[PDB]
Structures are given as C-alpha cells and as structure tokens.
C-alpha cells in the first residue's frame, strides 16, 4: 500500500546531493557618499562605508559586519554583528553562535548574543511547506486518485488496494476546497470534499518546528541592560486540523510560559488562541504577575471569492509586560486591549479594496489609538492607479491626522508598438499627488526605466512640487549594475539645496583559483568558472558577466533547491565553444558552490570524413589528442569538433584511422569552418 510505501514528496532532493560549498573567503563592500550644498552652510561631505567580511571554511560560515563613517572629521570603525552559522542535516536544523535575532512569532522579536538552534523550513521540499490538509483514505482495489481544486486538478496519482496518505498538496493560498475523487477499476467513483483555511501559526500534520535560544540580550538603546536569557519555542501539527504551540521565556527577572492551540474549522475558517502567563520584576523592586490572550480569527472567502476578513484581538491584563520592560534600566501604562480588523474585497477583477482598523486602549489612559487605512488599487490595461487614505487618532493628541495619496503608473508601451526597437519601450511615467487634508500638496511627476542593452542602467528623472512654502524639488538618479559592481549617482535639487549622491557596491571572493570581483552578494552565491571564455553573459540575471579570467559570481541562488545556471551562447566569443552551456547546483544556506563549465578556445570545425571513398559510419568517435577534443559522427561522415588547431590530425574509432587537415587564416577567422578530410 502507498501508506506503507516510503513515497517521497514532489520536488524532493536527497540531502546527499546538497552541496556544502567550497572553502573560500568573502568580502562585500558598500561605499556611499553625499555632497550636500546649501546656500546657508556652503557644502558638506558625508561618507559611509559598510564592510561585511566572511569565511566559508568547511560547513561553518563566519560572518562579520563593520561600518565606517566620515564627515566634512574622524574615522571610527564600528563592529555590528559577528556570527558563526552551520546547518545540521540530521536534525534538519540551523545552528548559530554569536550575534543574531530571535525569529519568535509566539513571542516578540528579540536581538541577542549567544547560541540558537532552530529548525529551518527551507530545507523541506517546496511541496511540504505552509499549511495544507493531508488526505487519509482506504481504497478498495487499485484506484486512481485525483485531488482537484475548485478550479483545476492538483494531485493525480495511482493508489494500491490499501491505506494511503497524501501530504504533497501545495499551500494553494489561504482558502481551498479540495475535492478528493478516487476512481476504482471496478467500483463506482468515490468523491468527498474538504475545505480548509490557513493561518501562519497552523502547521501540517506530523510537522514539528523548534527553537532553542540562549545568551545575553542585546538592544540598540543604551538604557536597556544586558541580562542572560533562554527561549524555547515549539510548533507541532496534531492530526485532524489541530496545532499545539508552546513557548518558554526565562531570565533572571522575567519568566513567561506561552501555550496556544490553533484549529482549522474548514468552511467556518481558522482560529488561533494562546495565553501567555508572565511573572516579571520591573525596573523597580515590585514584582508583577500577568496573563495575556491573543485571539486570532480568519474567515474564509465570503460570497464567491470576494471578501476576506481577519480579526486579531489581544487582551493584556494589568501586570503583563514583555521582556523589554523587565530589561529596562535600574530605574526607568499597559495595553488594556488591541483590535485589528482587516477586510479585503476584490471587485471588477481589477480593484482591490483593503480596509484595516487598529484600535488600542490602555489601562488608565482612556485615550484610544484608532488607525484606519483604506486602499483602492486598480489595474486597467497598462495603467496602474492607486488611491489611499489614512486616519490616525492616537493617544498623544495626534488630532485627525488624515492623509490622501494618488499614484498613477503609465508605461510607454501603452503608446509604443509591440516590436518597437526604441529604448523608450522600457520606460514609464509615474504621477503622485499627496494631500495632508490641510492644504499640504506634494506633486511628483517622473519618468523611469532602463536604457542599456542588458537593461542594467536604470534611470529615473522625477520633478516635483511641495506646496504648503512652494518648492520644486527635482530628482535624478542613475544606477548601473555591471559585472564588477553597482554604481549609483544621483542629483537632488531643491529650492536652495543640491545633494549629490554617489555610491559603489561590490563583492569579492578569495576562492582557491584567485580573487573574483562581482555584484554585491546575498547569502548563497554561485561561482561560475569558465576559464578561457572571457566576457560571457550569464542567463536570467542582469549585468552578471565573467571577468577576463572567466570567473563570475551570481548574486542570489535559491537555497536547498534545483536552480539552473546557463551561459548565454548568443553573446559569447565566436572562437569559444562550451561543452555544456547549462549546469545545475543545489547550494546550502550561505554556501559558495562552483558551477564548472568546460570551454574550448580553438576554432569550430565541421569535418567530412571519408574512408576508402566511403563516409564514416554513424556513431564513430572522432578524437584529437593534439588539442584534447572529441565528437561523434552524425551522418555522411560529418563530425563536429570544438577547440581545434589550424593544422592537425584526428583519430577515428568506428569500432583506428587517422585524418590530417590544414586550414587557411581566412578559415580561422570564419565563424564555423567546414572542411573535407579523407581518412587513412
């Protein structure tokens, strides 16, 4: 039966195929500079250099971050973060030593410095991510199952006569009505439907997420102290649409336990209720005990795919404080209630009305922090327009605080023809108008796009007008994403202010085969090594070209996934032919993986070989040891060779013959040469 069979999920990659990477250095630099010229204060120069060093030795990844600031008057190198990370495959987890952040969802985001061992969801196959019901069934006789969504089929497979569990269903959005239809060979078809509603705290059945964090507490504010603390987080997916999530936050003065359950009621929707009980010692000697409840509701699609409602209520009784209040200074009003109501309604298949309301009441201070947001985004053909309104009445006498915004994007392709070769096709006009409901108007009309062959050079010229003051603030920007780095230069003109921004960002890899420069790196990187193939653009990426040595670096690669790295054969020197123009690499988190390509630098040759005035047979192998090349005879004795010298000899092994040949310089200059050489 399928249930007893160890059927792997769709898109599953064995952990053995995962590439740890190579032992190599890493250095990402980002220099920025601002020249501000004001009539009142002459001119001033600001410089900020961000340097991010790293070393990937074995599987450990050491990373360090530093900042240097300069004014025009001193140099101050400032460390920020240092962390040694690793992935533990058997535990399906990631370990971090040193600085870091707590990714806690049940608890609040906490920055710390210590050891964190946390399960990682990226390591799981893409099919087994998010929330999706797992189908359990018993099929009498060999059957074929077609789990189909409201729109189309999803999972079609064959099931033996026995128990079967299917958990490869994709997330398929927040709401879905999966109709499971099994068709037996003999019996009539058996159908049943299951609806579902997903919540970010819900987990798949038999899925476990854990997080163990220990160490000192680090915060940007100088007032806050640095106490040692521990944090355990657990998220388990029970059968039948239940999820149990627990947590423990322990310290010297703060001890909290969070327990919560989430339920998938199907057509009704999704629910999540958790209670956190916390005993905290305030900055003063007083001890406070409290409990907080966070109820969260997600309604399914009302009408026919029109409305979605989210209701998040939070009741924090007096005496409930987060870890920050405990970690305040030695000597330094709680939220009685919070309500978030979000309603999204789609109309006309184009307009998407989003209404959001936050309503927070405090203990004692009866003033309520009301916040209403209304967005209306519509996409009529190429025109993309948006009207937004905001209204904020907070406790500290914020008044009405209303805001209105109108943004229109009009691509030039609306007027330009489809096949236009002008550079204006990759351009658009953006018009924005903002009102503060008091007479404050902020108009901004601009053109933007790209103007290079590879669409690297992105330009944006936007003028404006701020009126109460009447200031016409112009703004021009040019960003260039080349094969060595990104260079941006901009000119911001005001009534009496002229700002000149200039910056360069780049990445350096000191791998085994010399130093390679490229675009700024982003977690995992792919080092494409194609020696002898100079200035060969890679595919599906903008401005990533090999240097003179043939080594280039790809900024981003998906972790624990099959990603394709291809060299664009069109924009490659006619003297060079690649044995393989496409490679596949599966990198680990923050790993430098080498996608090696073999390139032949000699001329491209098509040889008609005849033996005893007879064409060589199909499948004959034609090699050349003079330049280490190989090929297979196609038909009529036609064989293809890449990377061959001007004058040479080849060997043919149909099942041992030699063929001599010479070529003129005009043939060497020709793109592809064709010659006939009778073999011995």
């Amino acid at each position: 039966p399928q249930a007893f069979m160890s059927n792997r999920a769709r898109g599953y990659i064995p952990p053995e195929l995962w590439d740890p990477g190579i032992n190599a250095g890493l250095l990402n630099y980002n220099f920025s500079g601002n020249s501000v010229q004001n009539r009142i204060g002459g001119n001033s120069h600001y410089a900020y250099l961000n340097l991010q060093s790293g070393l990937n030795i074995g599987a450990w990844r050491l990373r360090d971050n530093t900042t240097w600031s300069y004014n025009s008057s001193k140099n101050k190198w400032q460390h920020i973060n240092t962390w040694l990370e690793r992935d533990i495959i058997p535990l399906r987890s990631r370990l971090t030593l040193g600085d870091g952040y707590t990714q806690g969802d049940i608890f609040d985001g906490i920055n710390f410095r210590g050891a964190q061992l946390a399960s990682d969801d990226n390591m799981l196959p893409d099919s087994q991510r998010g929330f999706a019901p797992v189908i359990h069934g018993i099929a009498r006789g060999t059957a074929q199952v077609t789990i189909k969504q409201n729109g189309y089929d999803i999972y079609n497979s064959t099931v033996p006569p026995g128990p079967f569990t299917i958990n490869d269903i994709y997330a398929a959005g927040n709401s879905g009505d999966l109709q499971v239809t099994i068709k037996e060979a003999d019996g009539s078809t058996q159908i049943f439907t299951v609806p579902y509603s997903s919540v970010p705290l819900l987990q798949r059945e038999g899925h476990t997420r854990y997080s163990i964090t220990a160490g000192e507490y680090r915060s940007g504010n100088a007032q806050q102290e640095k106490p040692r603390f521990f944090q355990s987080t657990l998220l388990h997916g029970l059968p039948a649409g239940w999820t149990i999530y627990g947590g423990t936050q322990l310290a010297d003065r703060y001890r909290a336990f969070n327990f919560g359950i989430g339920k998938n009621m199907g057509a009704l929707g999704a629910l999540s209720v958790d209670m956190t009980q916390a005993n905290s010692t305030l900055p003063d000697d007083s001890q406070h005990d409290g409990q907080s409840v966070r109820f969260l509701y997600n309604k399914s699609l009302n009408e026919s795919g029109t409305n979605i409602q989210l209701v998040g209520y939070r009741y924090s009784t007096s005496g409930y404080f987060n870890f920050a209040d405990t970690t305040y200074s030695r000597m330094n009003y709680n939220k009685r209630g919070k309500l978030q109501l979000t309603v999204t309604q789609q109309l006309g298949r184009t307009s998407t009305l989003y209404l959001s309301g936050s309503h927070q009441t405090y203990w004692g201070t009866s003033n309520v922090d009301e916040q209403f947001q209304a967005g209306l985004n519509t996409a009529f053909e190429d025109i993309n327009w948006t009207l937004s309104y905001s209204l904020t009445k907070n406790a500290w006498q914020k008044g009405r605080d209303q805001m209105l915004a109108l943004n229109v994007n009009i691509p030039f392709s609306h007027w330009l023809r489809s096949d236009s070769k002008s550079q204006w096709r990759h351009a658009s006009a953006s018009y924005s108008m903002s009102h503060d409901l008091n007479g404050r108007m902020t108009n901004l009309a601009g053109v933007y796009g790209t103007l290079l062959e590879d669409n690297n050079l992105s330009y944006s010229v936007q003028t404006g007008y701020a009126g109460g003051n009447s200031g016409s603030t112009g703004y021009a920007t040019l960003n260039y994403r080349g094969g060595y780095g990104n260079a941006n230069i901009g000119y911001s003109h005001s009534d009496d202010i002229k700002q000149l921004y200039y910056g360069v960002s780049g990445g350096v890899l000191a791998h085994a085969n010399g130093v390679t420069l490229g675009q700024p790196l982003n977690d995992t990187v792919v080092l494409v090594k194609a020696p002898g193939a100079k200035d060969a653009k890679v595919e599906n990426q903008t401005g990533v070209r090999t240097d003179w040595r043939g080594y280039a670096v790809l900024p981003y690669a998906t972790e624990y996934r099959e990603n394709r790295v291809a060299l664009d054969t069109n924009t490659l020197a006619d003297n060079v032919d690649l044995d393989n123009a496409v490679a596949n690499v599966v990198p680990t988190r923050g790993a430098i993986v080498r996608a090696e390509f073999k390139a032949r630098v000699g001329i491209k040759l098509l040889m008609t070989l005849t033996h005893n005035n007879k064409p060589l047979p199909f499948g004959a192998m034609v090699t050349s040891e003079s330049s280490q090349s190989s090929g297979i005879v196609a038909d009529n004795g036609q064989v293809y060779l890449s990377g061959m010298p001007l004058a040479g000899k080849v060997q043919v092994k149909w099942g041992h013959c030699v063929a001599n040949y010479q070529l003129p310089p005009e043939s060497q200059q020709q793109l592809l040469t064709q010659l006939s050489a009778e073999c011995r």
Partner: protein
C-alpha cells in the same frame, strides 16, 4: 529623520523566463530573485527600527498575498502572478497596513532585502508578466 535612498524610489526587477513545467499547477513557484530597498541618513536615536508594507492589486481574493499581472497588447500570461517574500522567507500581504518584519537601523546606510517570485494559481499560460507594487516605510 531619513528617507528612501535616491534611485530606490522607482525600481525595476527582471524576473526572467520561467516555463509551464516549473509553473504547471497551483502553488508552484519559480526561483526567487533578490532586490534591496536602501535608506540613507537613518540614525539610531531618531528611528530605531523600520519596516515596509507593499500595496498591490491581488489576482484574486483567494490569493491576496500575490500580485496581478497587467494586460499587454501582445498578450498577458494567465493564472500567474508575482509574490513578494521577505528575509524570513514568508509571503507578504499586499494590504497597506500589513507591514513586514522589523529590522535594526544601523547608523547611516541601511539595506533591507526582499525576494520576488512567480506564483501560479492553476495551469499557467505563456506570455509576458508585468506587475506593479507600491511600498511605504514606517519607522519606530
């Protein structure tokens, strides 16, 4: 306070070419393409933390976390949209008020990374997928 870096106001991201084999059924996603939002002159004292929220047209009510591609004269792809991930790897609701994860504002330049991805709602027809989104930044 501070503001978005010059040039990061209007940004364009080339997702590339994706095939129906990669996006054949609902929930199938392509390879994420990275892009960053840059802020300058953000000091720790004035604003410790910041986050962004994207506002864009949803392809359908059921999938509110993915965008809707605009129609074109040549022909627009059907049953496919653009999805914006985060540093943690989770989807972002395209509502104006739903913000992203908080970040620590280092003194001076600060770059926030994000990923753009293709999200297929059913079988995907070939064509050209172009989508727009508007982002607002909140400082804490």
């Amino acid at each position: 306070a501070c503001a978005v870096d010059a040039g990061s106001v209007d940004q364009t991201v080339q997702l590339g070419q994706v095939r129906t084999a990669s996006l054949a059924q609902e929930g199938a996603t392509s390879s994420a393409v990275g892009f960053n939002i840059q802020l300058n002159d953000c000091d720790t004292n004035v604003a410790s933390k910041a986050a962004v929220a994207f506002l864009g047209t949803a392809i359908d009510a059921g999938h509110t976390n993915v965008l809707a591609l605009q129609s074109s004269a040549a022909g627009s792809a059907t049953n496919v949209g653009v999805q914006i991930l985060d540093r943690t790897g989770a989807a972002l609701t395209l509502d104006g008020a739903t913000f992203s994860s908080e970040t620590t504002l280092n003194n001076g330049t600060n770059t926030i990374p994000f990923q753009a991805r293709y999200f297929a709602t059913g079988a995907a027809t070939p064509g050209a997928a172009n989508a727009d989104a508007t982002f607002k930044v909140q400082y804490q």
